[PDB]
Symmetry: C3
Protein backbone atom coordinates (compact mmCIF):
# COMPACT_ATOMS: atom_id res chain seq x y z
CA UNK A 1 0.00 0.00 0.00
CA UNK A 2 1.17 3.51 0.88
CA UNK A 3 2.98 5.08 3.85
CA UNK A 4 2.95 8.78 4.67
CA UNK A 5 5.10 10.22 7.44
CA UNK A 6 4.74 13.87 8.34
CA UNK A 7 5.65 15.90 11.42
CA UNK A 8 4.52 19.31 12.66
CA UNK A 9 5.21 21.28 15.86
CA UNK A 10 2.98 23.11 18.31
CA UNK A 11 4.08 25.46 21.04
CA UNK A 12 2.54 24.77 24.44
CA UNK A 13 1.91 27.88 26.51
CA UNK A 14 1.95 26.63 30.08
CA UNK A 15 3.05 23.74 32.29
CA UNK A 16 -0.41 22.24 31.76
CA UNK A 17 -1.94 22.98 28.37
CA UNK A 18 -4.35 21.45 25.87
CA UNK A 19 -4.24 22.12 22.15
CA UNK A 20 -6.67 21.10 19.41
CA UNK A 21 -4.38 19.81 16.64
CA UNK A 22 -7.06 18.42 14.33
CA UNK A 23 -6.40 20.87 11.48
CA UNK A 24 -2.66 20.14 11.43
CA UNK A 25 -3.37 16.43 11.39
CA UNK A 26 -5.81 16.77 8.47
CA UNK A 27 -3.01 18.40 6.46
CA UNK A 28 -0.48 15.75 7.47
CA UNK A 29 -2.54 12.81 6.13
CA UNK A 30 -2.68 14.14 2.57
CA UNK A 31 -1.57 11.36 0.29
CA UNK A 32 -3.71 8.68 1.92
CA UNK A 33 -7.30 8.16 0.72
CA UNK A 34 -8.49 5.25 2.87
CA UNK A 35 -6.64 3.90 5.87
CA UNK A 36 -5.32 4.71 9.33
CA UNK A 37 -3.57 7.75 10.75
CA UNK A 38 -1.39 7.11 13.79
CA UNK A 39 -1.01 10.42 15.65
CA UNK A 40 2.18 9.97 17.65
CA UNK A 41 4.42 12.06 19.87
CA UNK A 42 7.95 10.84 20.48
CA UNK A 43 7.73 12.67 23.81
CA UNK A 44 7.34 11.13 27.26
CA UNK A 45 5.66 14.01 29.09
CA UNK A 46 2.76 14.95 26.86
CA UNK A 47 -0.01 12.73 25.46
CA UNK A 48 -2.59 12.46 22.67
CA UNK A 49 -6.33 11.89 23.18
CA UNK A 50 -9.31 12.02 20.81
CA UNK A 51 -12.19 13.87 22.45
CA UNK A 52 -14.33 17.01 22.55
CA UNK A 53 -12.49 20.31 22.48
CA UNK A 54 -15.20 22.24 24.30
CA UNK A 55 -13.76 25.18 26.26
CA UNK A 56 -14.56 23.88 29.75
CA UNK A 57 -13.57 20.31 28.95
CA UNK A 58 -10.19 21.51 27.63
CA UNK A 59 -9.59 22.68 31.20
CA UNK A 60 -11.14 19.57 32.82
CA UNK A 61 -8.70 17.17 31.11
CA UNK A 62 -5.80 19.04 32.71
CA UNK A 63 -7.41 19.60 36.10
CA UNK A 64 -8.44 15.96 36.43
CA UNK A 65 -5.03 14.82 35.25
CA UNK A 66 -3.69 16.93 38.12
CA UNK A 67 -6.18 15.33 40.51
CA UNK A 68 -5.21 11.80 39.52
CA UNK A 69 -1.46 12.38 39.60
CA UNK A 70 -0.68 15.56 41.65
CA UNK A 71 2.46 17.38 40.39
CA UNK A 72 3.27 17.95 44.07
CA UNK A 73 3.09 14.21 44.61
CA UNK A 74 5.90 11.89 45.62
CA UNK A 75 8.03 10.77 42.64
CA UNK A 76 11.42 9.05 42.81
CA UNK A 77 12.12 10.53 39.40
CA UNK A 78 11.99 14.05 40.83
CA UNK A 79 15.44 13.44 42.30
CA UNK A 80 16.63 14.04 38.74
CA UNK A 81 13.90 16.24 37.25
CA UNK A 82 10.59 17.54 38.69
CA UNK A 83 8.21 16.18 36.04
CA UNK A 84 7.52 12.67 37.34
CA UNK A 85 3.80 13.42 37.34
CA UNK A 86 3.92 14.26 33.63
CA UNK A 87 5.68 10.97 32.87
CA UNK A 88 3.18 8.94 34.86
CA UNK A 89 -0.05 10.45 33.56
CA UNK A 90 1.30 10.52 29.98
CA UNK A 91 2.23 6.81 30.16
CA UNK A 92 -1.26 5.91 31.32
CA UNK A 93 -3.07 7.98 28.66
CA UNK A 94 -0.67 6.97 25.91
CA UNK A 95 1.54 8.76 23.41
CA UNK A 96 -0.61 7.94 20.40
CA UNK A 97 -4.16 7.60 19.11
CA UNK A 98 -5.50 6.23 15.83
CA UNK A 99 -7.90 8.07 13.54
CA UNK A 100 -9.41 6.36 10.52
CA UNK A 101 -9.11 8.06 7.14
CA UNK A 102 -11.90 7.75 4.57
CA UNK A 103 -12.41 9.64 1.30
CA UNK A 104 -9.11 11.38 2.02
CA UNK A 105 -10.46 12.93 5.25
CA UNK A 106 -10.20 12.24 8.99
CA UNK A 107 -13.20 10.07 9.91
CA UNK A 108 -14.23 11.82 13.13
CA UNK A 109 -17.43 11.68 15.16
CA UNK A 110 -19.60 14.76 15.70
CA UNK A 111 -17.68 15.87 18.80
CA UNK A 112 -14.23 14.34 18.11
CA UNK A 113 -11.10 16.43 17.86
CA UNK A 114 -7.46 15.36 18.09
CA UNK A 115 -6.03 16.92 21.23
CA UNK A 116 -2.47 17.27 22.55
CA UNK A 117 -2.29 17.30 26.37
CA UNK A 118 0.79 18.94 27.88
CA UNK A 119 1.90 18.25 31.46
CA UNK A 120 5.46 19.61 31.36
CA UNK A 121 5.30 22.81 29.30
CA UNK A 122 5.92 25.40 28.02
CA UNK A 123 7.64 23.61 25.14
CA UNK A 124 7.73 23.14 21.39
CA UNK A 125 6.20 19.71 20.92
CA UNK A 126 6.55 17.64 17.80
CA UNK A 127 3.71 15.50 16.49
CA UNK A 128 4.31 12.68 14.03
CA UNK A 129 1.40 11.59 11.82
CA UNK A 130 2.21 8.25 10.26
CA UNK A 131 -0.55 7.18 7.89
CA UNK A 132 -1.01 3.89 6.08
CA UNK A 133 -3.59 2.73 3.57
CA UNK A 134 -4.31 3.32 -0.10
CA UNK B 1 -2.87 -4.83 0.87
CA UNK B 2 -6.53 -4.85 1.90
CA UNK B 3 -8.77 -2.52 3.93
CA UNK B 4 -12.06 -3.55 5.52
CA UNK B 5 -14.33 -1.00 7.18
CA UNK B 6 -17.42 -2.22 8.99
CA UNK B 7 -19.66 -0.68 11.64
CA UNK B 8 -22.18 -2.19 14.05
CA UNK B 9 -24.27 -0.74 16.90
CA UNK B 10 -24.89 -1.81 20.47
CA UNK B 11 -27.50 -0.44 22.82
CA UNK B 12 -26.21 0.49 26.26
CA UNK B 13 -28.69 -0.09 29.06
CA UNK B 14 -27.62 2.33 31.76
CA UNK B 15 -25.57 5.46 32.41
CA UNK B 16 -22.64 3.16 33.25
CA UNK B 17 -22.58 -0.08 31.30
CA UNK B 18 -20.11 -2.63 29.96
CA UNK B 19 -20.73 -4.79 26.93
CA UNK B 20 -18.70 -7.69 25.53
CA UNK B 21 -18.59 -6.94 21.78
CA UNK B 22 -16.11 -9.65 20.77
CA UNK B 23 -18.58 -11.63 18.63
CA UNK B 24 -19.64 -8.56 16.64
CA UNK B 25 -16.01 -7.67 16.04
CA UNK B 26 -15.18 -11.20 14.83
CA UNK B 27 -17.90 -10.81 12.18
CA UNK B 28 -16.70 -7.33 11.20
CA UNK B 29 -13.14 -8.45 10.34
CA UNK B 30 -14.24 -10.97 7.71
CA UNK B 31 -12.26 -10.28 4.59
CA UNK B 32 -8.91 -9.97 6.35
CA UNK B 33 -6.80 -13.10 6.92
CA UNK B 34 -3.68 -11.72 8.61
CA UNK B 35 -3.34 -8.20 9.94
CA UNK B 36 -4.68 -5.68 12.43
CA UNK B 37 -8.20 -4.79 13.53
CA UNK B 38 -8.64 -1.28 14.90
CA UNK B 39 -11.77 -1.29 17.09
CA UNK B 40 -12.84 2.34 17.15
CA UNK B 41 -15.73 4.40 18.46
CA UNK B 42 -16.26 7.85 17.00
CA UNK B 43 -17.81 8.75 20.36
CA UNK B 44 -16.27 10.90 23.09
CA UNK B 45 -18.08 9.50 26.13
CA UNK B 46 -17.58 5.76 25.86
CA UNK B 47 -14.33 3.80 25.46
CA UNK B 48 -12.89 0.48 24.27
CA UNK B 49 -10.69 -1.84 26.34
CA UNK B 50 -9.43 -5.39 25.79
CA UNK B 51 -9.76 -7.39 29.00
CA UNK B 52 -11.58 -10.17 30.85
CA UNK B 53 -15.36 -10.11 30.71
CA UNK B 54 -15.85 -11.93 34.00
CA UNK B 55 -19.13 -10.94 35.68
CA UNK B 56 -17.63 -9.17 38.70
CA UNK B 57 -14.90 -7.47 36.69
CA UNK B 58 -17.50 -6.11 34.25
CA UNK B 59 -18.84 -4.20 37.27
CA UNK B 60 -15.37 -3.30 38.63
CA UNK B 61 -14.34 -1.44 35.45
CA UNK B 62 -17.34 0.87 35.86
CA UNK B 63 -17.12 1.25 39.63
CA UNK B 64 -13.42 2.07 39.53
CA UNK B 65 -13.96 4.44 36.63
CA UNK B 66 -16.46 6.16 38.92
CA UNK B 67 -13.91 6.18 41.75
CA UNK B 68 -11.20 7.76 39.60
CA UNK B 69 -13.44 10.39 38.02
CA UNK B 70 -16.63 10.84 40.14
CA UNK B 71 -19.68 11.81 38.02
CA UNK B 72 -20.58 14.16 40.88
CA UNK B 73 -17.17 15.77 40.53
CA UNK B 74 -16.40 19.33 39.48
CA UNK B 75 -16.36 19.77 35.68
CA UNK B 76 -16.37 23.07 33.79
CA UNK B 77 -18.00 21.20 30.93
CA UNK B 78 -21.07 20.50 33.05
CA UNK B 79 -22.12 24.11 32.50
CA UNK B 80 -23.17 22.87 29.06
CA UNK B 81 -23.88 19.17 29.64
CA UNK B 82 -23.52 16.95 32.74
CA UNK B 83 -21.22 14.28 31.31
CA UNK B 84 -17.79 15.81 31.90
CA UNK B 85 -16.75 12.74 33.85
CA UNK B 86 -17.54 10.52 30.86
CA UNK B 87 -15.41 12.71 28.59
CA UNK B 88 -12.47 12.69 30.97
CA UNK B 89 -12.33 8.98 31.78
CA UNK B 90 -12.99 8.06 28.12
CA UNK B 91 -10.12 10.29 26.94
CA UNK B 92 -7.73 8.64 29.38
CA UNK B 93 -8.73 5.05 28.49
CA UNK B 94 -8.91 5.78 24.78
CA UNK B 95 -11.50 5.41 22.03
CA UNK B 96 -9.77 2.51 20.32
CA UNK B 97 -7.84 -0.71 20.83
CA UNK B 98 -5.99 -2.94 18.37
CA UNK B 99 -6.51 -6.68 18.03
CA UNK B 100 -4.29 -8.76 15.78
CA UNK B 101 -5.92 -11.00 13.19
CA UNK B 102 -4.36 -14.34 12.27
CA UNK B 103 -5.79 -17.20 10.20
CA UNK B 104 -8.85 -15.02 9.65
CA UNK B 105 -9.62 -14.92 13.40
CA UNK B 106 -9.15 -12.45 16.28
CA UNK B 107 -5.85 -13.37 17.96
CA UNK B 108 -6.96 -13.11 21.60
CA UNK B 109 -5.39 -14.38 24.80
CA UNK B 110 -7.14 -16.91 27.04
CA UNK B 111 -9.02 -14.24 29.00
CA UNK B 112 -9.23 -11.43 26.41
CA UNK B 113 -12.52 -10.02 25.21
CA UNK B 114 -13.23 -6.76 23.41
CA UNK B 115 -15.29 -4.61 25.76
CA UNK B 116 -17.23 -1.37 25.26
CA UNK B 117 -17.36 0.79 28.41
CA UNK B 118 -20.24 3.28 28.61
CA UNK B 119 -20.15 6.28 30.94
CA UNK B 120 -22.99 8.38 29.49
CA UNK B 121 -25.75 5.92 28.59
CA UNK B 122 -28.33 4.69 27.83
CA UNK B 123 -27.51 5.14 24.14
CA UNK B 124 -27.11 3.39 20.82
CA UNK B 125 -23.36 3.32 20.33
CA UNK B 126 -21.66 2.73 17.03
CA UNK B 127 -18.45 0.72 16.76
CA UNK B 128 -16.20 0.96 13.72
CA UNK B 129 -13.89 -1.98 12.98
CA UNK B 130 -11.27 -0.91 10.47
CA UNK B 131 -9.05 -3.83 9.53
CA UNK B 132 -5.91 -3.86 7.43
CA UNK B 133 -3.68 -6.69 6.26
CA UNK B 134 -3.85 -9.41 3.64
CA UNK C 1 2.73 -4.64 1.82
CA UNK C 2 4.42 -6.84 4.43
CA UNK C 3 3.35 -8.35 7.78
CA UNK C 4 5.76 -9.56 10.44
CA UNK C 5 4.53 -11.37 13.54
CA UNK C 6 7.01 -12.26 16.26
CA UNK C 7 6.65 -13.12 19.93
CA UNK C 8 9.13 -13.14 22.81
CA UNK C 9 8.78 -13.75 26.56
CA UNK C 10 9.99 -11.89 29.62
CA UNK C 11 9.96 -13.13 33.18
CA UNK C 12 8.52 -10.69 35.70
CA UNK C 13 10.15 -10.83 39.11
CA UNK C 14 7.49 -9.53 41.46
CA UNK C 15 3.77 -8.85 41.79
CA UNK C 16 4.47 -5.32 40.55
CA UNK C 17 7.34 -5.05 38.09
CA UNK C 18 8.48 -2.92 35.17
CA UNK C 19 10.71 -4.17 32.38
CA UNK C 20 12.37 -2.26 29.54
CA UNK C 21 11.67 -4.46 26.50
CA UNK C 22 12.96 -2.09 23.81
CA UNK C 23 15.85 -4.32 22.71
CA UNK C 24 13.62 -7.37 22.26
CA UNK C 25 11.17 -5.31 20.24
CA UNK C 26 13.94 -3.96 17.97
CA UNK C 27 14.85 -7.57 17.12
CA UNK C 28 11.21 -8.55 16.55
CA UNK C 29 10.59 -5.90 13.86
CA UNK C 30 13.35 -7.14 11.56
CA UNK C 31 11.84 -7.59 8.14
CA UNK C 32 10.03 -4.25 8.11
CA UNK C 33 11.85 -1.15 6.83
CA UNK C 34 9.19 1.56 7.11
CA UNK C 35 5.89 1.15 8.91
CA UNK C 36 4.25 0.49 12.26
CA UNK C 37 5.06 -1.91 15.08
CA UNK C 38 2.13 -2.87 17.29
CA UNK C 39 3.56 -4.04 20.63
CA UNK C 40 0.81 -6.23 22.06
CA UNK C 41 0.30 -8.50 25.04
CA UNK C 42 -2.52 -11.02 24.89
CA UNK C 43 -2.64 -10.74 28.68
CA UNK C 44 -5.27 -8.97 30.78
CA UNK C 45 -3.21 -8.16 33.87
CA UNK C 46 -0.11 -6.48 32.51
CA UNK C 47 0.15 -3.49 30.15
CA UNK C 48 2.46 -1.75 27.66
CA UNK C 49 3.50 1.91 27.80
CA UNK C 50 6.08 3.95 25.88
CA UNK C 51 8.00 6.19 28.28
CA UNK C 52 11.30 6.89 30.05
CA UNK C 53 12.96 3.95 31.75
CA UNK C 54 14.79 6.05 34.33
CA UNK C 55 15.40 4.10 37.55
CA UNK C 56 13.12 6.15 39.81
CA UNK C 57 10.37 6.46 37.22
CA UNK C 58 10.36 2.68 36.72
CA UNK C 59 9.26 2.54 40.37
CA UNK C 60 6.86 5.52 40.08
CA UNK C 61 4.76 3.88 37.34
CA UNK C 62 4.08 0.94 39.68
CA UNK C 63 3.61 2.98 42.85
CA UNK C 64 1.20 5.38 41.20
CA UNK C 65 -0.65 2.52 39.57
CA UNK C 66 -1.05 1.19 43.11
CA UNK C 67 -2.25 4.60 44.29
CA UNK C 68 -4.87 4.88 41.57
CA UNK C 69 -6.19 1.33 41.93
CA UNK C 70 -5.14 -0.11 45.35
CA UNK C 71 -4.60 -3.91 45.24
CA UNK C 72 -6.30 -3.98 48.65
CA UNK C 73 -9.28 -2.23 47.11
CA UNK C 74 -12.80 -3.59 46.71
CA UNK C 75 -13.19 -5.76 43.58
CA UNK C 76 -16.10 -8.06 42.79
CA UNK C 77 -13.68 -10.08 40.69
CA UNK C 78 -11.67 -10.99 43.78
CA UNK C 79 -14.40 -13.48 44.68
CA UNK C 80 -12.80 -15.62 41.98
CA UNK C 81 -9.18 -14.40 41.92
CA UNK C 82 -7.39 -11.61 43.84
CA UNK C 83 -6.06 -9.61 40.89
CA UNK C 84 -8.99 -7.32 40.12
CA UNK C 85 -6.74 -4.30 40.54
CA UNK C 86 -4.39 -5.62 37.85
CA UNK C 87 -7.30 -6.09 35.44
CA UNK C 88 -8.64 -2.60 36.05
CA UNK C 89 -5.41 -0.62 35.78
CA UNK C 90 -4.26 -2.71 32.78
CA UNK C 91 -7.55 -2.05 30.95
CA UNK C 92 -7.19 1.68 31.48
CA UNK C 93 -3.54 1.85 30.34
CA UNK C 94 -4.08 -0.55 27.46
CA UNK C 95 -2.56 -3.81 26.29
CA UNK C 96 -0.76 -2.30 23.32
CA UNK C 97 1.23 0.68 22.06
CA UNK C 98 2.38 1.62 18.56
CA UNK C 99 5.94 2.50 17.63
CA UNK C 100 6.79 3.77 14.17
CA UNK C 101 9.54 2.04 12.21
CA UNK C 102 11.81 4.02 9.89
CA UNK C 103 15.02 2.96 8.14
CA UNK C 104 14.48 -0.48 9.66
CA UNK C 105 14.72 0.89 13.22
CA UNK C 106 12.29 1.83 16.02
CA UNK C 107 11.60 5.56 15.65
CA UNK C 108 11.85 6.56 19.32
CA UNK C 109 12.24 9.95 20.97
CA UNK C 110 15.28 10.82 23.09
CA UNK C 111 13.76 9.42 26.29
CA UNK C 112 11.37 6.78 24.87
CA UNK C 113 11.62 3.12 25.76
CA UNK C 114 9.05 0.35 25.36
CA UNK C 115 8.07 -0.78 28.84
CA UNK C 116 6.07 -3.76 30.12
CA UNK C 117 4.19 -3.01 33.37
CA UNK C 118 3.30 -6.04 35.50
CA UNK C 119 0.57 -5.89 38.16
CA UNK C 120 0.01 -9.61 38.78
CA UNK C 121 3.47 -11.21 38.75
CA UNK C 122 5.74 -13.08 39.05
CA UNK C 123 4.98 -14.60 35.64
CA UNK C 124 6.38 -15.39 32.22
CA UNK C 125 4.73 -12.81 30.00
CA UNK C 126 4.50 -13.07 26.26
CA UNK C 127 4.82 -10.02 24.02
CA UNK C 128 3.60 -10.05 20.43
CA UNK C 129 5.16 -7.56 18.00
CA UNK C 130 3.02 -7.36 14.89
CA UNK C 131 4.61 -5.06 12.33
CA UNK C 132 3.22 -3.80 9.05
CA UNK C 133 4.72 -1.65 6.32
CA UNK C 134 7.24 -2.12 3.54
ZN1 LIG D 1 11.77 13.55 33.44
ZN1 LIG E 1 -20.49 16.59 26.78
ZN1 LIG F 1 -8.42 -12.37 37.26
Amino acid sequence: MKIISKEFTVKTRSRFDSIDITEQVSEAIKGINNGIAHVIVKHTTCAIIINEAESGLMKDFLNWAKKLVPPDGEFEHNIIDNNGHAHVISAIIGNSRVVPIIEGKLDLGTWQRIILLEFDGPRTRTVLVKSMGE
